[PDB]
Structures are given as structure tokens and as C-alpha cells.
Write a protein that binds this ligand. Structure first.
Ligand SMILES: Cc1cc2nc3c(=O)[nH]c(=O)nc-3n(C[C@H](O)[C@H](O)[C@H](O)COP(=O)(O)OP(=O)(O)OC[C@H]3O[C@@H](n4cnc5c(N)ncnc54)[C@H](O)[C@@H]3O)c2cc1C
Ligand SMILES: Cc1cc2nc3c(=O)[nH]c(=O)nc-3n(C[C@H](O)[C@H](O)[C@H](O)COP(=O)(O)OP(=O)(O)OC[C@H]3O[C@@H](n4cnc5c(N)ncnc54)[C@H](O)[C@@H]3O)c2cc1C
Ligand SMILES: COc1cc(OC)c2[nH]c(=O)cc(C)c2c1OC
Ligand SMILES: COc1cc(OC)c2[nH]c(=O)cc(C)c2c1OC
Ligand SMILES: [Zn+2]
Ligand SMILES: [Zn+2]
Lengths: 230, 230
């Protein structure tokens, strides 16, 4: 029945390590016969700000602007900006969404934060029933593929940065799990810049390798225990 | 001495609950005789995207664009875009920085994430070495004044969202502490959209009342234990 993959990609430089990782995911998932689409946010000059431009025609309450309410009603009334709905159509059709980004301040770059803020609107991604286990994107897989400046040692529990999993919580749980995604284990490529050449080649190779059996994987249990506990 | 306060404010609607919490801070700090400046991000149409437009000089490596490297050298050389250096002057002069924002996906709205990505560059906010307790903003205070959709109850260890302190980690530790700020306890105003008129007025006056004695507070111990316990 085939599978559709969306890669949401947030790097300014096509020759970057992130670009290589995105390119390998494209090469390998396309080799398997999957339908692959990439949202190259910087190349699209993707709008990160949540503003009233995100609603076309006339606001639900033009006196006091409430982004959440107005985007909810806009979704229901098919009245959202086309950049947003173009993205929601790719997500709707995806079986798997991979986010490929460098870690910026223990989180996603603002351009990709703006994608999550604007694309994952109430009525599309969640509503009152239909959050966490029940969220509107249930059935879909999501996966963070993150590159870091810090070596793997810095990201241990008693290290300076604390555990990798500590920063994962707002993205995996607060965002992806909230919307119904099952979350595969994050791919974390530690510290590509302090190399080496061969060691960079090796991390790109390992991601490609993992993508081979991505469809065999089980989701993580997306829990406070998984992130912080023992 | 007296003191300088910068409020970095991220809400689209001046009549909003965020609007009121920013306005009471300006009013109370101004009443005390403090110097007060507000960076009203949406009104400034503040650029959230980290791009090569943020550097105007000869790039250190114009064949492969690396945002961290290029902004660090642009800072030393003074070729950063001026919107960034305008913010930096505000932070440099400040004794206290307050971030006033609605929680968006367990984090800051993208427009304010872009402020942290672009303004807190290497050379200015931190160096290597020169971070966490050696951060370049040592001696300044910071405070997150966050509003939520979820109730206090929802943000407890056994509630749907887990403890409120879990989502504070990337912002308090990975960003502010990393830059050397001493972090004051977060002001979290839970679920104003749900709350009654009296409860909302109550939340605004509790912030006003807290600001009366802010200069007397000790910072939090910004550690994994404060954040996750326990
Ligand atoms: C605003 C900001 C905030 C940040 N916050 C954090 C943080 O909170 N925590 C943290 O750890 N880090 C942080 N960083 C560091 C950041 O996460 C790293 O800079 C980034 O992940 C490096 O990945 P890259 O793709 O840009 O590396 P690149 O510099 O693009 O790649 C490294 C090398 O790989 C080469 N390359 C590309 N493809 C290949 C290939 N196939 N094989 C071999 N070599 C290849 C490149 O040419 C380059 O020499 C931050 C950086 C910035 C700018
Ligand atoms: C993209 C997105 C992501 C989100 N992610 C999360 C999340 O991860 N977790 C979560 O909990 N929530 C989330 N939310 C919900 C969001 O945090 C809240 O909607 C926001 O915190 C509420 O603050 P506000 O200023 O917008 O409230 P408002 O809607 O502006 O205020 C509520 C009421 O208070 C009134 N008010 C204004 N001033 C005063 C005053 N002086 N005295 C008394 N009343 C006053 C207003 O008139 C209004 O009637 C998200 C929302 C969006 C849009
Ligand atoms: C803002 O840039 C940041 C922020 C960080 O932590 C918050 C970082 N932590 C690390 O362990 C290693 C690096 C390199 C790093 C970094 O820049 C390269
Ligand atoms: C995407 O918007 C979000 C995301 C959330 O958690 C991620 C939320 N959690 C809550 O507890 C309560 C609310 C209102 C909420 C919210 O607004 C609808
Ligand atoms: Zn979860
Ligand atoms: Zn800390």
C-alpha cells in the first residue's frame, strides 16, 4: 500500500551536515519505493510568526485578536493562509514525519518552531477530545533527527547540559505526542563540527542504515518516566 | 542604583492577558523609579529566522554557511544586522530581563525563540569557554513570566502535561543559565481563559505585588534537581 514520508527540514546551507542527513533520508526512502516530500523551511522563507495574516477574509473577532481561537475557526471555515494549509495537506497525507534540524537552545530553530506553532492548529492536530493518545494525528509516526554542538558526554544526567531526553520533552511529548503521533526514538547526531571527516561519514551512514528498517521500529513510550525517570 | 529592566514581550494583542501582565510590570517598575524598556516583538515585526541576512560583512566561509561561526565573527567585527545589535544594547544595559509570553507548545512562541536564537550570539551572551556560571551575562537576572492554556492541576507530575518545571528546562537552564543569567523563579499565570474575572484580576495583582519585592528575591538553583526532583 506504500508509505508517504514528509521531512520538515531546517537548515540554511545545502552542504551542511543537516543537509547531508536530509539528502540521505531522501535517497534511502526513495530507494525503498516510499513517497517522499521535503519542506525546506529556509528555502521556502517559511513565516514563523503567529499573526492575523494567518487568517484570510474576516476575523471571528476583529476587536480582540486571539490567535488560537481565530486559527481554530479559520481551520473549520477553510479560511487559513495557504502556506499553512499547504503544510497541513503534506502532514495529513504523511505516514511518517521526520524533522531534521540542528539543536538551537535545547530546542528547534525558530523557523521550525513557527512551523509547529502555525501548522499544528486546533481542529487539525488536536482538540478537546483528541490529544495525547487520542490526538488528531493518531496513526502517524514522527521522528526527531537532531544534530548538536555538544559531544554525547555533555548530554548525560550529571553532565553540564543534563540528559538529552530532558530537552526532548517539549518536542516529543508536549508537541508530537500531544497531536497523536507515535514517536520513534530520536536520531541524535552528536557534534559533527568537531569531526572527524571519517566520523562525519560514519554518522551519515548510520542514519541511512537505520532508515532501512524504520518501518519495523516500535514507538518509544512517550512518558515523563521515559524522559526524566529511572 | 537604580536598576534597568528589559521586558521582552511576545503577544499580538494589547488587550490580552499577556498585555495586561506586561503593562502592570511597566507600571510597577516605573512606580519604583526603575528604568524600563519593552521590546514588543510582534509590533516590531521582529525577524525570527536565523539567516545569512544577519551578517553584512565578508563571510568567514562564503562557500559553506555556518550560522554560529558567521554570527560570532560578525559580532567581533561589528557586521551583525542592526536589529540584533539594537536588542543586544538593551540586554547589555539591563540588570533584569523579563520575558512575558503565552506558552506555545511547552515553549516560547517562535517570534521570541528567534529573539533568543539571533540575539544571544557567541561573543555576546557566551563564549567557549564562558558559559553557564561563566556566561557573559553573569550578574544579570532573568525571569520567565509565562501564561498557559492548561491549569495548575494539569501541570503537576500526575496531571496530563507533567510538572510545569519540566518545560522550563530548555529556557531556564539551556538558554538563560547557559548565558550566565541568574534565574528568578518563574511567574506562571495558569489558564486565564478558563479563570473568572476575579481570578484573572487576582493573577495580575499577584504579579504586581510580587514585583514590589523582586529586588529582594534570590535566584532558583537552576539545576536538574530543581527541575525534575524527586
Ligand atoms: C543559535 C544556535 C543555538 C545553538 N544551541 C545549541 C544547543 O542548545 N546545544 C548544542 O549542543 N548546540 C547548540 N548549537 C550548536 C548547533 O546545534 C550545531 O552548530 C549544529 O548542530 C552543527 O550541525 P550542522 O549541520 O550545522 O554542522 P555543519 O557545520 O554544517 O557540519 C559539520 C561538517 O560536516 C561537513 N559535512 C556536510 N555533509 C557531510 C558528509 N556527508 N560527510 C562528512 N562531512 C559532511 C560540513 O561541510 C562541515 O564541515 C547552537 C547553534 C546555534 C547557531
Ligand atoms: C500555537 C499555540 C500553542 C499553544 N501551546 C500551549 C501549550 O503548549 N500548553 C498550554 O497550556 N497552552 C498552550 N497554548 C494556549 C496558550 O498558552 C494560552 O492561550 C495563552 O497562555 C493565554 O494567554 P492570553 O494572553 O492569550 O489570554 P487572553 O485570551 O488574552 O486572556 C483571557 C481573558 O483575560 C482577559 N484579560 C485581559 N486583561 C485582563 C486584566 N487586566 N484583568 C482581567 N482579565 C484580563 C482577556 O480579556 C480575556 O478575556 C497554545 C496556544 C497557541 C496559540
Ligand atoms: C547557543 O549555542 C550553543 C548552546 C549550547 O547549549 C545551550 C551548546 N552546548 C554545547 O554543549 C556545545 C555547544 C557548541 C553549544 C552551542 O554552540 C555551538
Ligand atoms: C497547542 O495548544 C495547546 C497545547 C497544549 O499542550 C501541548 C495545551 N495544554 C493544556 O493543558 C491546555 C491547553 C489549552 C493547551 C493548548 O491550547 C489549546
Ligand atoms: Zn509523551
Ligand atoms: Zn541551570
Amino acid at each position: 500500500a506504500g508509505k508517504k514520508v514528509l521531512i520538515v527540514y531546517a537548515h540554511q546551507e545545502p552542504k551542511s551536515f543537516n543537509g547531508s542527513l536530509k539528502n540521505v533520508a531522501v535517497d534511502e526512502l526513495s530507494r525503498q519505493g516510499c513517497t517522499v516530500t521535503v519542506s525546506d523551511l529556509y528555502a521556502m522563507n517559511f513565516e514563523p510568526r503567529a499573526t492575523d495574516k494567518d487568517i484570510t477574509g474576516t476575523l471571528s473577532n476583529p476587536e480582540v485578536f486571539n490567535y488560537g481561537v481565530e486559527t481554530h475557526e479559520a481551520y473549520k471555515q477553510r479560511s487559513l493562509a495557504s502556506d499553512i494549509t499547504d503544510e497541513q495537506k503534506k502532514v495529513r497525507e504523511a505516514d511518517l514525519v521526520i524533522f531534521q534540524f540542528p539543536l538551537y537552545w535545547f530546542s528547534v530553530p525558530a523557523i521550525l518552531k513557527g512551523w509547529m506553532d502555525r501548522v499544528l492548529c486546533q481542529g487539525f492536530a488536536f482538540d478537546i477530545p483528541g490529544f495525547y493518545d487520542s490526538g488528531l494525528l493518531q496513526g502517524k509516526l514522527a521522528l526527531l533527527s537532531v544534530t548538536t554542538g555538544g559531544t554525547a558526554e555533555m548530554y548525560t544526567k550529571t553532565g553540564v547540559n543534563g540528559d538529552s531526553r530532558y530537552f526532548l520533552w517539549p518536542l516529543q511529548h508536549g508537541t508530537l505526542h500531544f497531536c497523536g503521533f507515535k514517536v520513534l526514538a530520536p536520531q541524535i547526531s552528536f557534534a559533527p563540527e568537531i569531526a572527524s571527516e571519517e566520523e562525519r561519514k560514519g554518522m551519515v551512514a548510520a542514519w541511512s542504515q537505520r532508515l532501512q528498517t524504520i518501518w519495523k521500529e516500535e514507538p518509544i513510550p512517550c512518558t515523563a518516566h521515559w524522559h526524566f525517570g529511572q
